């Protein structure tokens, strides 16, 4: 239970905050390195730097002096040097030709008792330096000590978005070996904007030389005792306790035990006696991937906006565009755009959302009547030709084209319905050529006195007023019901992986699940397939067109039987859908009941009164 740092910076007080970050796995397996003369064992291997490093150092004589972080460490790439020389702290980012065996040297004079730094053998050359820092001068002790280890120094190193982040804490100790017990949170120390690709690192130590160290440069050297421990940063979720002063005083590793998982779910450090449903074997998600349609195959906005002929208003043209990445660059007046209303939905922020089958309706109307294309209008257009629903979630687009629709003779091929029996239900097209009976004359389609013809042409002339001109109109209608894998605003995607617990986000549907190859065959009009519980259990994905099934990182029934945290920490687990293996741990005392498989409890042949109900007649208790 070491290395719980401060994830964020927002000052909190007495508010338990569940967080998903990179932390030390509780009771993990750390590597241990020595500097013990007795063997020499001047350990300084090059180690991996996977996702961040926990570095602990037990010292009494300032042997561990710094680190170098990099990828190749050979002047072809850039490396970071963090060193503590006898006088300053030096942080440099350059192209170093590091030595194969870097170290520092302290020499001891017998005639006058004094330890002073003589050697600095770390790199040959450093050429292109981008970042540099030198601290204010100090004098360090450097004296060799004889007791046991007196100082523990803990560091956490992270590399995120071009920032190298360092947390640290110092603690007094009195021990001889191993990493000690206890808890202490590290505090933020520094945040360096280096912008390099660290993959490996190497520890920088110091040497002792005297008159008792006889030899050449490569053999006349002793070591001085010191030890250091290296741990890595895996993704996991934790519960943190903030107290009234703002310090982290306790933590729960939410994936250590089923008991810890119940603690994490209840968001408390105390669990009462009962049955708590943790999950089946649960693996914290290690990754997250997103997949949206490829950035090609745009919607045919051209075939709706730039067309040769638009239909008349009595029989408008309706089109359904789907399975495209619509970009909404039309709003800019790239061509003439007289109007842009967009009731109900903002076009600016519309891009970020994923919609279903945005219908486009196209027609040609006269100049005055463009207003009548709105929710709640009362006119010949909005009573017998084209009627908008009261609640509208779309976008009315109207522009003027006098040059295409005004023949000097007159474009009389555009017509509209004048006489109708009753008003039009929303979005109903009634294309008929009957003879309207305006009076009690049964005229049997002869267009006589009191019988008219509903359709009547439009008079269009170039030498005419603005009010009586031809305006072309297009009405975008956005709807959203189910299966939204059709229209989706342009967004980049990542790679696809199989067989892990990964956060998935497909065409606007997110989740955390294992992806596997599926034998399911989807008809062309479907993308999402659901099981009996309705939870999405299938996905197609446009780029690969390959069916993928969705498994919750836990499937089955689980219940944890606890005597009470006050009494004990021992707990039993019941798996409701296992016949005794889909269990967290087998242990011993595996007992089968009609309620499921019970692990962690001893079965007795007595029959007492019920203490803790398990089910199907089975009860549990905490006895001697």
């Amino acid at each position: 239970t070491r290395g719980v740092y401060y994830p964020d910076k927002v000052f909190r007080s007495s508010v338990l905050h569940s967080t998903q970050d990179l932390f030390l796995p509780f009771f993990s397996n750390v590597t241990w390195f020595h500097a013990i003369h007795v063997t020499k064992r001047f350990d300084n291997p090059v180690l991996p730097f996977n996702d961040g490093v926990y570095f602990a150092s037990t010292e009494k004589s300032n042997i561990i002096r710094g680190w170098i972080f990099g990828t190749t460490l050979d002047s072809k790439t850039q490396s970071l040097l963090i060193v503590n020389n006898a006088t300053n702290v030096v942080i440099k980012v350059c192209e170093f030709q590091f030595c194969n065996d870097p170290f520092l040297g302290v020499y001891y004079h017998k005639n006058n008792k004094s330890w002073m730094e003589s050697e600095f053998r770390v790199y040959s050359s450093a050429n292109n330096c981008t970042f540099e820092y030198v601290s204010q001068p100090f004098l360090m002790d450097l004296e060799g000590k004889q007791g046991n280890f007196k100082n523990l120094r803990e560091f956490v190193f992270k590399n995120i978005d071009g920032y190298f982040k360092i947390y640290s804490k110092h603690t007094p100790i009195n021990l001889v070996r191993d990493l000690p017990q206890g808890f202490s949170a590290l505090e933020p120390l520094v945040d360096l904007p280096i912008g390099i690709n660290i993959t490996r690192f190497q520890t920088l130590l110091a040497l002792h030389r005297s008159y008792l160290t006889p030899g050449d440069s490569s053999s006349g050297w002793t070591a001085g005792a010191a030890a250091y421990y290296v741990g890595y940063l895996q993704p996991r979720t934790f519960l943190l306790k903030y107290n009234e002063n703002g310090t982290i005083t306790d933590a729960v590793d939410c994936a250590l035990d089923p008991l810890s998982e119940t603690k994490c779910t209840l968001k408390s450090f105390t669990v009462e006696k009962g049955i708590y449903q943790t999950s089946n074997f649960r693996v914290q998600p290690t990754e997250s991937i997103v997949r949206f349609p490829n950035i090609t195959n745009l919607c045919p906005f051209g075939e709706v906006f730039n067309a040769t002929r638009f239909a008349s208003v009595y029989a408008w043209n309706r089109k359904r565009i789907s399975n495209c990445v619509a970009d909404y660059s039309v709003l800019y007046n790239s061509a003439s755009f007289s109007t842009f209303k967009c009731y109900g939905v903002s076009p600016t922020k519309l891009n970020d959302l994923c919609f279903t089958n945005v219908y486009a309706d196209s027609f040609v109307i006269r100049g005055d009547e463009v207003r009548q294309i709105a929710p709640g209008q009362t006119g010949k257009i909005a009573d017998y030709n084209y009627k908008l629903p009261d609640d509208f979630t779309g976008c009315v687009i109207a522009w003027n084209s006098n040059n295409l629709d005004s023949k000097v003779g007159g474009n009389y091929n555009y017509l509209y319905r004048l006489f109708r029996k009753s008003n039009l239900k929303p979005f109903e097209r009634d294309i008929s050529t009957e003879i309207y009976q305006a009076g009690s004359t049964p005229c049997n389609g002869v267009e006589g006195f009191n019988c008219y013809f509903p359709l009547q042409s439009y008079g269009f002339q170039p030498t005419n007023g603005v009010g009586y001109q031809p305006y072309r109109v297009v009405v975008l209608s956005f709807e959203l019901l189910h299966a939204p894998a059709t229209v989706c605003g342009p967004k980049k995607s990542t790679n696809l992986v199989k067989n892990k617990c990964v956060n998935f986000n497909f065409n606007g549907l997110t989740g955390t699940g294992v992806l596997t190859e599926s034998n399911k065959k989807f008809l062309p009009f479907q993308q999402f397939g659901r099981d009996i519980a309705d939870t999405t259990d299938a996905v197609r994905d446009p780029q690969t067109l390959e069916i993928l099934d969705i498994t919750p990182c836990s499937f089955g029934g689980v219940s944890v039987i606890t005597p009470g945290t006050n009494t004990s920490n021992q707990v039993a687990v019941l798996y409701q859908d296992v016949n005794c293996w889909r269990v967290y741990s087998t242990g011993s005392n595996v007992f089968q009941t009609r309620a499921g498989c019970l692990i962690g409890a001893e079965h007795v042949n007595n029959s007492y009164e019920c203490d803790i109900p398990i089910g199907a007649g089975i009860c549990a208790s905490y006895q001697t």
Partner: antibody
Framework: QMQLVQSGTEVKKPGESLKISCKGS????????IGWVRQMPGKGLEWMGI????????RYSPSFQGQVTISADKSINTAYLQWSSLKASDTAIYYC????????????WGQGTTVTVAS | DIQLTQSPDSLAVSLGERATINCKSS????????????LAWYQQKPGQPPKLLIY???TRESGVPDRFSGSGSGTDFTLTISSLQAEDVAVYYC?????????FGQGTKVEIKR
């Protein structure tokens, strides 16, 4: 995101006529429904009116209906709020804010212009 | 035509504590077509224009920190600040934008405590 710049601070005696301009600068200004809001000293906001630049469809509030006039000029992308005869109770700060459509929250707010009417 | 109500008027909490503000509407403001609540939360600092904070009563505008959360349904909506900081002391307004005219909230003043 197109920013709105307001005209400025005017001090007037009672009985005058007052015109306040809201200027809209930025790309994409083809669908922004301009609206006006008045904040009396140390009180909550009270929405007044909304006009579409161009078409000039104008929707008012029942309390302010006919007290003031909201008009728009499309060529230079401006909105004008006019008082025919401002009284002595009109000292307050006015903000012009532009939504992107009808039934859309107002996200871009102009600085705002105070009005003082007194001796 | 649909007046709103807020509560509490003035609330004092310590640094790092939660803060809950409640907005109540006369009638449900749910759009049938898209099934999205129409209600927004605004922040105003003394001497500056208000800023959008939450729209649709569940989504956050770009750049708003996670601390600010919005929840609720039917007619009852709430804004929760998980942990308050030294920059959030201000006045918060709940506005409904379903049908014109757009009514505003009374306004809640958030101040720290010593």
């Amino acid at each position: 995101q197109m920013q709105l710049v307001q005209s400025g601070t005017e001090v007037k005696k009672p009985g005058e006529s007052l015109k306040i301009s809201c200027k809209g600068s930025g790309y994409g200004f083809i669908t922004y429904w301009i609206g006006w809001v008045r904040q009396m000293p140390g009180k909550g906001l009270e929405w007044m009116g909304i006009i579409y630049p161009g078409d000039s469809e104008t929707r008012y509030s029942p309390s302010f209906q006919g007290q003031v006039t909201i008009s728009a000029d499309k060529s230079i992308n401006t909105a004008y709020l006019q008082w025919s005869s401002l009284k002595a109770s009109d000292t307050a700060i006015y903000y012009c804010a532009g939504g992107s459509g009808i039934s859309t929250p107002m996200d871009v707010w102009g600085q705002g212009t105070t009005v003082t009417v007194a001796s | 035509d649909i007046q709103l109500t807020q509560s509490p008027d003035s609330l004092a909490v310590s640094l790092g504590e939660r803060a809950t503000i409640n907005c109540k509407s006369s009638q449900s403001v749910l759009y049938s077509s898209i099934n999205k609540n129409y209600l927004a939360w605004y922040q105003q600092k003394p001497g500056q224009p208000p800023k959008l904070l939450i729209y649709w009563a569940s989504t956050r505008e770009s750049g708003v920190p996670d601390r600010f959360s919005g929840s609720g349904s039917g007619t009852d909506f709430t804004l929760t600040i998980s942990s308050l900081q030294a920059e959030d002391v201000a006045v918060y307004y709940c506005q409904q934008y379903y049908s014109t005219p757009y009514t505003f909230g009374q306004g809640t003043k958030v101040e720290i405590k010593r």
